[PDB]
Amino acid sequence: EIPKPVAPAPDILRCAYAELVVTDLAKSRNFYVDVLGLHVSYEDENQIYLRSFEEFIHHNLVLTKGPVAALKAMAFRVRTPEDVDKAEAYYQELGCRTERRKDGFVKGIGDALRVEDPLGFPYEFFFETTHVERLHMRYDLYSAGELVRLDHFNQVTPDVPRGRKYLEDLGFRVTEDIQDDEGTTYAAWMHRKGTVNDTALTGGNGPRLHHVAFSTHEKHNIIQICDKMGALRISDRIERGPGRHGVSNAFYLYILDPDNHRIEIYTQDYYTGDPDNPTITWNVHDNQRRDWWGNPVVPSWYTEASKVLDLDGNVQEIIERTDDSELEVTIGADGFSFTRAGDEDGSYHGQASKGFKLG
Amino acid sequence: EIPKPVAPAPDILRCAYAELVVTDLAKSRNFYVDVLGLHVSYEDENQIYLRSFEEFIHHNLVLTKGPVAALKAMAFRVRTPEDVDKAEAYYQELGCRTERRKDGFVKGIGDALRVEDPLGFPYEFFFETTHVERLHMRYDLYSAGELVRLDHFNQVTPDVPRGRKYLEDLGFRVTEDIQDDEGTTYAAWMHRKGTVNDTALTGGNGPRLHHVAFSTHEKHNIIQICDKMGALRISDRIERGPGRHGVSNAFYLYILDPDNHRIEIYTQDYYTGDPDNPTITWNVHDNQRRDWWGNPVVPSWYTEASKVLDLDGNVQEIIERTDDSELEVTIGADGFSFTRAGDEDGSYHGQASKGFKLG
Amino acid sequence: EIPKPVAPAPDILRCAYAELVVTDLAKSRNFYVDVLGLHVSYEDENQIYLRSFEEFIHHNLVLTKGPVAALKAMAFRVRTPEDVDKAEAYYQELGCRTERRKDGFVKGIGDALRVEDPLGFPYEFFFETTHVERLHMRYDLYSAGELVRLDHFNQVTPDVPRGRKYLEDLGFRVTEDIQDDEGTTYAAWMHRKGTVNDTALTGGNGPRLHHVAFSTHEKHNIIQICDKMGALRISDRIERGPGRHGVSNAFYLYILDPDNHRIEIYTQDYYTGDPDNPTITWNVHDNQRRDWWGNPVVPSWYTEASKVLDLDGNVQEIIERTDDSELEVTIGADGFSFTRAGDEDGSYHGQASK
Amino acid sequence: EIPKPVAPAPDILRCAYAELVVTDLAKSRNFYVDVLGLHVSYEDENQIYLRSFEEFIHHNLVLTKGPVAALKAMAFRVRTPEDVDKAEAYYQELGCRTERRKDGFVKGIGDALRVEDPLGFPYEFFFETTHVERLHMRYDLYSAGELVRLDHFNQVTPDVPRGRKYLEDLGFRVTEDIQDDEGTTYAAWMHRKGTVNDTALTGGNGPRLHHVAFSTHEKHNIIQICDKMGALRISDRIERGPGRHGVSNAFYLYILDPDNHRIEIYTQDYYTGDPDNPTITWNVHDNQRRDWWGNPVVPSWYTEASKVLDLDGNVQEIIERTDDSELEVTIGADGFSFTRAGDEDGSYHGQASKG
Ligand SMILES: O=S(=O)(O)c1ccc(O)c(O)c1
Ligand SMILES: [Ca+2]
Ligand SMILES: [Cl-]
Ligand SMILES: [Cl-]
Ligand SMILES: [Cl-]
Ligand SMILES: [Fe+2]
Ligand SMILES: [Fe+2]
Ligand SMILES: [Fe+2]
Ligand SMILES: [Fe+2]
């Protein structure tokens, strides 16, 4: 159990950026800039700094060339410079390794703290960042698939309640989760900025990074990304979707970058900023919980995720989940799901929905 | 081979309506009216007559109570009253059974000819029909999922080239097809009204009716149908999609009515009215041909289809396809598909795309 | 200037609901329910309580039958029950008239404070509210024009800087404003919940309520409201739009209810939650500031607005703006606007655009 | 009245392309290619050949550098090569001037007939055309404002009934029109391809070209064109809209190219292909007939339109309309319009709607 510090939690505003290590900078650039249309704030032979259409901070995504593709940092912006000091004291009380750089780890960020958190994830906290031209009315640049914001991260961790408790102490509030009747938790979503999530926990072997999510304005923008990937003959990099989520109610798509980092495209979740925002718990066997239309969840969604680094740049050792597997209990040979609770019509046993089993 | 008659073909305008036999009229009404929003032109204890938002003829769909669910007629409107006489002479020359009713088979249709066509399908040709209020600007009635037109039919038949030649002689032009490199045709689409299709042939045991298709204005309307089916907890009646087609380039969805009659919702195909419109042939192993995003085609899409009736109302006997099966050659045991021609990366051997196999 | 209380400001979450007095309850019901598709949370012969598709608090709009159409209260939800006590102490220190009802003024709200604020507006602060079924996935009920959230209020007041400073003291942060080179402020927008606004000030004679805004998911939903109004042959109740705003970047529409209360439909403004969110100032003569496409702003949009009531239910007296008029300086006889600053081509003099 | 030929009318498929004379080819290129995103089929120092996203024929728009901006030809494609013969005989019987070129007037068109028609318009009829890559699934190229098809032309002509009869004999069917209670016709729309129009007649001084219209897939595509024009700070080239039409029920926008040639962007009209398609007639004083939302029609929309050329490349003389003016009777000093027929409330006297 991760203790609650006496030291006050930093006031976290929102997810702000991720630094992903990539193996081939030019191929990664082709994906994030030419395919997805993100906007370059800075680049050189070592790194590409990218932002979304409506962002004013320096970036939402740093692509860093390195030997092993991995998450290097998931960064949250805090409310004041003083909250970076609060972050440092807080994680020091937790007994985590921390590293503080007054002039930042990446360009366009100032005073920053990186930590190996209690779940093995490299978190960054910062306030100071270089402002850039906010492109929100640059309709001369707007693409048919425009990514307009960074919305959230999603983390794979073996023990969801243990991680949830720690994130609650840090000020994140649970919006939705997935459980079964025998009391196992499979996933939880939690926020600071008044949307369904800023980070989320997916049960699985970890620490691994499940995905980073960007939003679009409208559903047709997500459709266009799919259409464009078809035209580029890279439909094999469309992992899952598009669909409507149960959890979050957002329209969604999952795609894979050249190093298999998973990117979610997302729109039209709901407001969660009231403190008594009603929590929603889904049964793991409800076949509308992940895709509201009942479409099957592709097995790689449950099995594959990115390595994460420690503060030395080495890959974090993975710890196996011992709680039940969502894949197994829903779409594996022993699994089951339902459309209507208690109704055998529209229920699936030992296979996925829509007539498929696991390949 | 079906000979070309000496008698002139009737001048066919478009697909106009289908008559489906249903087993429980109230259950079927709930699907087509309460779920899908079609507009009631007339109903009684035996039939429901339904039209789309932009239609001015009496109906696009007749639901007729009967003991065995089946297609009873697919009806095409012809250009003049005299074209019904032409139809009669044409099909008589083909040696087909025909039935002529000066005052119609169904309400709101006048002088009509029904025929057991050379592929065993019940076709109707008519000109005369009762005009009704055209609801195309009745935005006070417009549904978030509104079906705006009848678009096409799709027929399952064992020998696609045989049927294709007959429909070409009747004046339908093939817009797209699916073939392999060994002389097999798996499917063809053909039109009169200047869209991708008015009827289509899908290879398989037949005669059976694969689907009837209605159009929407925009892609979000199709999304809404899915969303509504989730809210009604009938997502199990979403068979396949939503997607982007390769063939037709339309955005699409397939759903199943209470008797398992398949309905396609469709939007934003392209203009085909020029007489040298380029015919697009897809290779059967191209994994973007049916779903442009490479999502797998659900096996029921290839195996399941509705019975069709003869003019006496008895079910037509099924003739087995002996040509190769699209299912088997793409997703079955010895199947193959590709993302990029000649690339092993993104190819699938003996399974479907996206991590699935046949149940 | 309105002094800052020593008493701590209540922690305001967001705009939550408006109580509008209407003269014919059935006619108003037809507009808000049958035309606009809002969801009934309670109704009787005197009041209709309505909410948007994604709401979980009891209501976003209360229609109350009364003799004179007016705004009766514009209500903000606060973070905790103790914030209602804070609001009471705060407005008492401002010297404002206050009324506290521990069981609420309207159904589905608990302990609530109403105040005649320093600008003459009836504000309510509350925490307690009856939760209802959140309809956000009830796509069986979803309209082609569905209104999904309450987004903001917009207030007409004569001195925008005076009101702005007062709202900033209450914790609202300015996101955008309209000024000229002479130093006049014509309008400001300000927020708590991390969108472009929860309330906004339009320079003019006040206190009057300019509009209440609801959001949709997508731009086609706004189109559909216009299309429906054409089908119902009430297109004369479309006042302005649909358009793209300059300020806020939102897609918008303004329509008029049966008592001439103005309702905005709005979608797709941007995130403002960071405390150093860059503030945008437009020049009043920029013809893309209000409608990005340069469509003219109809004079009624500048001149017409709803009465507001005091705590006794009487109409608040109005104070005339003495600062320059946006209408006069842009589309009046001596006004002007530009498409490109410094270019006579695409400029309009003594005249609106187009 | 224009007589009906004994000679059979050509089978016309659809509107196919327009040739527009422009004064500065580079400025026009910037508008049609960089702003609007049309696809270049061919270009040189004198001409740009452009097509829409879903087209397979060579082009939908030819921009031809010349000294006077004008319509040079509005072209319709016919069903067979023999229909170009039929067209030639038909217009010859009408007593119209004709010119036929076996190798075309512009690149990518083969055997083609141009005529000075009975209303003074330069029509082309052709079958043969060079097929190009259909870009309908090139979503790697797709713009947020993508123009997907050529939809129609709209012609300004002084006597609408006279022109209507002639187009009906030529095989166009009237889908919608605007009349009043005193026997005046102000406008008519007419088709071959099964949409609301392929060409249309707008009452006014003519011959002039009112506009050329291109389709989008969705309404948001039209909104994006407006948004982009705002970002480019050329919102003054937005003339009217966006809106919903009464006539046609399409979502629409009107913009102005660098020589003031008017382009409509259009989507989601309805199917008209049945021969008994119900004709819809609006009253000229109905304020929802042109913009369904009641937004006012700016006077320039009524007064301004492009010159057209004869077969020698000279500007056609303009004949004045003597029938009542739609502008005057609706928004002029003595004009009138209504929201609800018979209701004084929401009516407008001697001014336009919405203030
Ligand atoms: O017309 S404005 O662009 O000034 C504008 C922007 C945001 C609003 O909410 C508003 O009502 C007005
Ligand atoms: Ca082969
Ligand atoms: Cl999910
Ligand atoms: Cl398909
Ligand atoms: Cl119009
Ligand atoms: Fe996610
Ligand atoms: Fe189909
Ligand atoms: Fe507003
Ligand atoms: Fe037009």
In this structure, what CATH number is given to the domain that contains residue B333?
A: 4.10.1270.10
> CB-CB: which of A134, A275, A278 is closest to C79?
A275
Rg (chain D; Cα; Å): 20
User: In terms of Cα–Cα distance, which of C262, C314, C305 is closest to C116?
Assistant: C314
> What residue of A is the nearest CA neighbor of B231?
A292
Residue-range definition of the domain harbouring residue B46: 10-148
Helices assigned H by DSSP within D120-218 = 160-169
**What is the rounded distance in angstroms from the CA atom of residue B330 to the CA atom of residue A76?**
46
Q: Which residues contact B207 (CB under 8 A, 6 or more apart)?
A: B119, B120, B121, B155, B156, B157, B308, B316, B318, B319
The 3-state DSSP class for residue C165 equals helix
Same domain (yes/no): A139, A165: no
Cβ-Cβ pairs closer than 8 A, B with C, add up to: 43
The 3-state DSSP class for residue D135 equals coil
Residue A1 forms part of a structural domain: no
Are residues A119 and A207 in contact, defined by beta-carbon separation less than 8 angstroms? Answer: yes
Residue A223 forms part of a structural domain: yes
Q: Which residues contact A34 (CB under 8 A, 6 or more apart)?
A: none
Tell me how long chain B is.
359
State which ligand 1 atom lies nearest to the alpha carbon of C187.
Answer: 4
Phi, psi dihedral angles at B67 (to 5 degrees)? -75, -30
Q: Does A315 touch chain D (CB under 8 A)?
A: no
**Inter-chain touch D217–B268, beta carbons under 8 Å:** yes
Q: In chain B, what are the helix, strand and coil shares in percent, each to the nearest 5?
A: 15, 35, 50
**What is the rounded distance in angstroms from the CA atom of residue A220 to the CA atom of residue A40?**
24
Same domain (yes/no): B112, B176: no
> What residue of D is the nearest CA neighbor of C246?
D230
> CB-CB: which of A131, A268, A274 is closest to C13?
A274
Largest CA distance in chain C: 61
Same domain (yes/no): B161, B264: yes
**What is the rounded distance in angstroms from the CA atom of residue B260 to the CA atom of residue B241?**
16
DSSP 8-state class, residue D338: B
The 3-state DSSP class for residue D157 equals strand
Same domain (yes/no): C211, C266: yes
State the total domains in chain A: 3
Residue A351 forms part of a structural domain: yes
Same domain (yes/no): C279, C295: no
Task: Give the residue numbers of the binding site of C for Mn(2+).
Answer: 152, 211, 264
**Protein residues with C-beta less than 5 angstroms from the ion ligand 2:** B 180-182
- What is the whole-number distance in angstroms between the Cα of residue A24 and the centre of ligand 3? 29
DSSP 8-state class, residue C98: E
Q: Does C219 touch chain D (CB under 8 A)?
A: yes
Q: Does D268 touch chain B (CB under 8 A)?
A: yes
Closest ligand to Cα B186: 4
Same domain (yes/no): D125, D24: yes
Best probe of the D interface among B193, B216, B270, B272, by most D CBs < 10 A, is: B270
Closest ligand to Cα A301: 3
**What is the rounded distance in angstroms from the CA atom of residue B105 to the CA atom of residue B123?**
12
Same domain (yes/no): D120, D40: yes
Q: What's the gap in Å between the CA of A158 and the closest CA on chain C?
A: 30
> CB-CB: which of A239, A244, A345 is closest to B227?
A244
> What residue of D is the nearest CA neighbor of A226?
D139
User: In terms of Cα–Cα distance, which of C338, C226, C353, C221 is closest to C282?
Assistant: C338
Q: Does A230 touch chain D (CB under 8 A)?
A: yes
In this structure, what CATH number is given to the domain that contains residue A233?
A: 3.10.180.10
Give the DSSP letter string of A96-122: --EEEETT-SSTTB-SEEEEE-TTS-E
State which ligand 1 atom lies nearest to the alpha carbon of C266.
Answer: 9
Q: Does A14 touch chain C (CB under 8 A)?
A: yes
**What is the rounded distance in angstroms from the CA atom of residue D347 to the CA atom of residue B64?**
49
The 3-state DSSP class for residue C127 equals coil
Q: What's the gap in Å between the CA of A236 and the closest CA on chain B?
A: 6
- What is the whole-number distance in angstroms between the Cα of residue A247 and the centre of ligand 6? 9
Q: Which residues contact D184 (CB under 8 A, 6 or more apart)?
A: D284, D323, D324
Listed resolution, Å: 1.5
**Inter-chain touch D140–A220, beta carbons under 8 Å:** no
Decide which of D117, D133, D148 is a domain's last residue: D148
**Ligand 1 site residues, Cβ closer than 6 angstroms:** C 154, 200, 213, 245-248, 250, 264, 290
Q: How many whole angstroms from its chain centre is CA C309?
A: 16
Task: Give the residue numbers of the binding site of A.
Answer: 152, 181-182, 211, 264
**What is the rounded distance in angstroms from the CA atom of residue B331 to the CA atom of residue B357?**
7
**Inter-chain touch C230–B139, beta carbons under 8 Å:** yes
Residue B1 forms part of a structural domain: no
Report which residue type is found at A344: E
Best probe of the D interface among A139, A141, A238, A267, by most D CBs < 10 A, is: A139
**What is the rounded distance in angstroms from the CA atom of residue A125 to the CA atom of residue A112?**
6
> CB-CB: which of B139, B142, B228 is closest to C139?
B228
**Protein residues with C-beta less than 5 angstroms from the ion ligand 4:** B 290
Other CB atoms within a 10 A radius of the CB of residue C71 amount to 24
Q: Does A239 touch chain B (CB under 8 A)?
A: yes
Are residues D144 and D221 in contact, defined by beta-carbon separation less than 8 angstroms? Answer: yes
Same domain (yes/no): A63, A140: yes
Report which residue type is found at C320: E
State which ligand 1 atom lies nearest to the alpha carbon of C254.
Answer: 11
Residue A4 forms part of a structural domain: no
Decide which of B272, B287, B302 is a domain's last residue: B287
Are residues B281 and B178 in contact, defined by beta-carbon separation less than 8 angstroms? Answer: yes
Same domain (yes/no): D140, D253: no
Stated as kind and residue range, the H or E segment containing C28 is helix C25-29
Residue C4 forms part of a structural domain: no
- What is the whole-number distance in angstroms between the Cα of residue B211 and the centre of ligand 7? 7
Stated as kind and residue range, the H or E segment containing C88 is helix C82-93
Neighbours of chain D (3+ CB pairs under 8 A): A, B, C
| Structure determined by | X-ray
> What residue of C is the nearest CA neighbor of A192?
C273
> CB-CB: which of D137, D194, D276 is closest to B249?
D137
Q: Which two tokens stand for residue B329?
A: 């050659």
Residue A207 forms part of a structural domain: yes
**What is the rounded distance in angstroms from the CA atom of residue B358 to the CA atom of residue B350?**
9
Q: Does A67 touch chain C (CB under 8 A)?
A: no
Phi, psi dihedral angles at D155 (to 5 degrees)? -110, 135
Q: Does C2 touch chain D (CB under 8 A)?
A: no
Same domain (yes/no): D227, D120: no
Q: Does B299 touch chain A (CB under 8 A)?
A: yes
Residue D2 forms part of a structural domain: no
Q: What's the gap in Å between the CA of A310 and the closest CA on chain C?
A: 28
**What is the rounded distance in angstroms from the CA atom of residue B353 to the CA atom of residue C79?**
49
**Inter-chain touch C271–A134, beta carbons under 8 Å:** no
B59 annotated as a binding-site residue: no
User: What sign has the CA pseudo-torsion B287, A230, B146, B16?
Assistant: negative
Q: Does B293 touch chain D (CB under 8 A)?
A: no
Q: Residue D187: is it exposed, middle or buried by C-beta count within 10 angstroms (0-12/13-18/19+)?
A: buried
> What residue of A is the nearest CA neighbor of D144?
A144
**What is the rounded distance in angstroms from the CA atom of residue D229 to the CA atom of residue D223?**
10
**Inter-chain touch B277–D13, beta carbons under 8 Å:** no
Residues 114-133 of A with CB under 8 A from C: 131
Q: Which residues contact A200 (CB under 8 A, 6 or more apart)?
A: A152, A153, A154, A155, A187, A188, A189, A190, A210
> What residue of A is the nearest CA neighbor of D230?
A139
Decide which of D287, D320, D342 is a domain's last residue: D287
Are residues C82 and C176 in contact, defined by beta-carbon separation less than 8 angstroms? Answer: no
Q: How many CA atoms lie within 13 A of D223 on its CB side?
A: 21
- What is the whole-number distance in angstroms between the Cα of residue D252 and the centre of ligand 6? 37
> CB-CB: which of C220, C231, C232 is closest to B220?
C220
**Inter-chain touch A359–B359, beta carbons under 8 Å:** no
Alpha carbon distance, N-terminus to C-terminus of chain A: 38
Same domain (yes/no): B197, B271: yes
User: In terms of Cα–Cα distance, which of D253, D261, D265, D332 is closest to D299?
Assistant: D332
Question: At which residue do the structure tokens 């709401």 appear?
Answer: C55
Report which residue type is found at D172: F
Q: Which CA distances in Å does D337 have to B237, C315, D44, D262, D287?
A: 50, 36, 49, 25, 5
Q: Which residues contact D309 (CB under 8 A, 6 or more apart)?
A: D21, D70, D71, D72, D122, D315, D316
The 3-state DSSP class for residue A153 equals strand
Same domain (yes/no): B95, B216: no
